Amino acid sequence: TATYAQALQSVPETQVSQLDNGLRVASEQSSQPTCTVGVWIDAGSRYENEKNNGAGYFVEHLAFKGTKNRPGSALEKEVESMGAHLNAYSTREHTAYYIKALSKDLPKAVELLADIVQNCSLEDSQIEKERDVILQELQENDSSMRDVVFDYLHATAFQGTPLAQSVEGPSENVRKLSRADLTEYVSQHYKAPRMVLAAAGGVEHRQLLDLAQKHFSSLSGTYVEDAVPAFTPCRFTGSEIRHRDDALPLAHVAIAVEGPGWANPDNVPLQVANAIIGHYDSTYGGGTHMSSTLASVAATRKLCQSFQTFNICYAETGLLGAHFVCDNMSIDDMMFFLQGQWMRLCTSATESEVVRGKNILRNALVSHLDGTTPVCEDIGRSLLTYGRRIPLAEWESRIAEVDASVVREVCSKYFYDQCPAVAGLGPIEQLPDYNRIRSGMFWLRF
Amino acid sequence: LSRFLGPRYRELARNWIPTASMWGAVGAVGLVWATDWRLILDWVPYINGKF
Amino acid sequence: PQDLEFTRLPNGLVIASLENYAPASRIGLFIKAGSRYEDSNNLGTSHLLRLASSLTTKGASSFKITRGIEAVGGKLSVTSTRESMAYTVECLRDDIEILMEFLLNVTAAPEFRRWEVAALQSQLRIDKAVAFQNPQAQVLENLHAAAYRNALANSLYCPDYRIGKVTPDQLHYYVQNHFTSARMALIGLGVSHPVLKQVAERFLNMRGGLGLSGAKAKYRGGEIRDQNGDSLVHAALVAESAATGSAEANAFSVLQHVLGAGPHVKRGSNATSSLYQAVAKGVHQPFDVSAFNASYSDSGLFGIYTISQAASAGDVIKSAYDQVKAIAQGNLSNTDVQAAKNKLKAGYLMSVESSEGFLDEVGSQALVAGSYMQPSTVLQQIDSVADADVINAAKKFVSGRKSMAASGNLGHTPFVDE
Amino acid sequence: AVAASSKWLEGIRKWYYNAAGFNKLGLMRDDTIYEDDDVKEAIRRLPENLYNDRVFRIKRALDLTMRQQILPKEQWTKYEEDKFYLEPYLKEVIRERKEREEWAKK
Amino acid sequence: MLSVASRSGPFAPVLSATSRGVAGALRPLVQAALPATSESPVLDAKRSFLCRESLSG
Amino acid sequence: SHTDIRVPDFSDYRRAEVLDSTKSSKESSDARKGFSYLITATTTVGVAY
After folding, report:
1. How far apart are CA A251 and CA A425, in angstroms?
2. Shortest CA distance from B20: residue in chain A
3. Which of C311, C358, C363, D10 is deepest in the core (most CB within 10 A)?
4. Is the CB of A369 inside 8 Å of chain E's CB atoms?
5. What is its subcellular localisation (chain F) (predicted)?
């Protein structure tokens, strides 16, 4: 029978092509009746100065409302006539558009996509309708507290850079930026070779390349305006923000330090180390004696609603840390018991706390990749940030060489005697000071 | 006894024999200075604190 | 390869195994017990039986379970409806002989010690307060009580007056009566046929033939209104309709997709749904409308669901009720029927792309029928419905008795019979 | 370990039962044990009829001692009518503690 | 096609010994928020967001 | 009332070696902690003698 070793290399491969402009065309074919097709671009809020911060949040908020050949109602009526779906998102560093259809309808699909990215019109009446929807969504999400604190945190830990501004923008700025500002944005950022055309499911590579050459090749391959920005390695400061607002029921807190980048080979041991702390919420089944030393104490003294660990990574910098939501008299107990577990791990770390973490990472790597939509969304970033999609066997061979000493060394390098960043949202008066938080970042015995 | 028998307490012991060894070394050397202990004050001729 | 391999047994228990070459693997057990199967004296037993999947067993203690599972990495989970229950286990390909001994013994031979049960009764309050933070678990519990009398009227949670009194004799009674051999199905996704057959042959020693199965669930018209401090009114009009497994349920499904159940394009204005456009002719406000379908094994409920504001609740409702009349009057094209027949095919084929939807699809129809049937037959069956059936299905809705439920500030809202 | 001497072990056990004197106050053998963290657990695993009795045999035999007297001779706890009520709840709190401790060892 | 989820509609609770509990389906999808003013009421010993249950790394 | 917020300028208080916002501080991290601890390291000796 198939063993986990001889089944990890039977996964079908990944073809890659290229055009004269420079588009990369990737795919993998699995023999079904369904497919997903999309385009991932290389622009974001990080490429924008102070003069137009929310601009990229209209272009994909206005993309499905009518091209120059098919107005918006016609476009949608056509796409529901087939029975398909459309979707789009954007983050600090990436932007995507993609559609989900049935395998026979690839030629009708690839034609629609090329029509959206290449040329569309900006309708002034549609701008007037659009602006107020944006202005209402701002207040819509100013009431989710797991989204304001991951924005204060980014604001105080990157104080002077372009990496500390928000996706949507300040309110005063989403009231002035007009047609001209948007059209040069679309001209200067949407271009090749910053683009990838990705597809997965029952697609054929040669047919996909043929269909790509027809609808896409009428495209400007030589850089316009020679607008080449220079990367600035990110600054990282030790600040702290506090907002009081005494009438809420519960308190939110997050704390973090600096981390690696995307291509740094130090990511795997940090994954193995963060899987040992764990996660917990007050509706889990078998609490109060689950293996983590932090979950098992919160379950039995009832200090938490929940906590978790995060590992955000950019091209050069990162963040490592933790988030917890709690009552108003149990904050310093949480911070004491949290810092203790990091220090117990900078130093001695046994050889049974490491096989468990290895298994957890090895087993969370495969379930996140079963389906058809994830695989495409994978192929698009895994190729816009390295190249070379990195099969499963190559990840696996990097997990057979982590040991207790390796975890010790990297934990000592990135955690021990460093200055963190801290954000908290009310009711927060038992939050210990910066002196007494900083002095928890090194033992005195060792 | 049996509550303390295992490899983990022996591992903590061999891990913190640095702690016990430094603790004992500092204590022993301090016990020389505290009581004007001339008998080890001479083992190093470098502390000429006796006038 | 071997798309499925059925095998009946001398006491039921269909076993179906598909063999593949994936790195991970899943197993599941499917049972015919639900909230529908309890009488008036023990309301709440199944919502505690769902909560107690990690207690001490005659083959392992609750310290052995929670630690042997987390050592290798796997997962356990339980999911329930008003008609059935499912226990599922999930992990890698070389660690699969281990989790299966835990799963097969959590369900066969439990013990209920009266000092763990006595501590699992503060959990019910937390669970029921979490599930009730979205205002359509509430409105969908008053709609089954307002429309039935006996079987399908029970809720999926526990009544408040009842929280501290669940006792360890009722759990024994329930499990003994209903977890019977001839009502269960075992489905495994990445393993071969003889292994499952062997391991489940140790699972028949317990109980040969089925426990009770009463309560035919007769119909009544019920109105239940509940007033509170939310700022938006939720409403629902339904009517009795077809049971699954018959020739008219497909007509009601095609009617549902003509009428407009669900969006396709992100952040769009639904231009291919009739009743949305009918409503939006004189209502310039935020709002939302859709159709409604539920198809239990003996009866069903077809209708409409609306979300609207305070001083404009009536106008919306008695304007989406006019449109449904027109279709019943012969005003129906034959191209929009074609356009609606494509939504079913697309959605159904996408519903089983994953390896988690495949299990549920197979396990669902391995209980109510007893055999498998491939998607190709399904597409033919759903493409052999005519145009007169969609028309006469809408006449059953208009000439029939109703159930409403609402909840919000019910100041400007119509009673039934109005 | 012996069989023919088990009549003698019975003989010495009936003498040591009388020489110790908890029966003249009404108590039973399980009433006398010393309450550490492991006997404090096995007490709140008792049904209510068993737990209520234990709180009256311990309050009537700690009042006879404030007065320096003893109960009448017809009410002395016999030898073959003492039932070990707290024994089974105590073998189980213990063997669950040898299990949580050889896991940290392996 | 013989389940209750293949025809979107009435809910189905789930509950797990490693992850958070979920309340059945949602609705066929989320149209109710595209027009403005759905404040999503809060301040009730609330339940957090984004459902951090299954990751990749 | 939410998206808006800029931490005001701490430019005139910074160290001269981290006052540039272009380059990182992982290079400018050992000198600071080797400087600010020698005051204490002197202090312990002073207390001792």
Report:
1. 6
2. A445
3. C363
4. yes
5. Membrane; Mitochondrion inner membrane
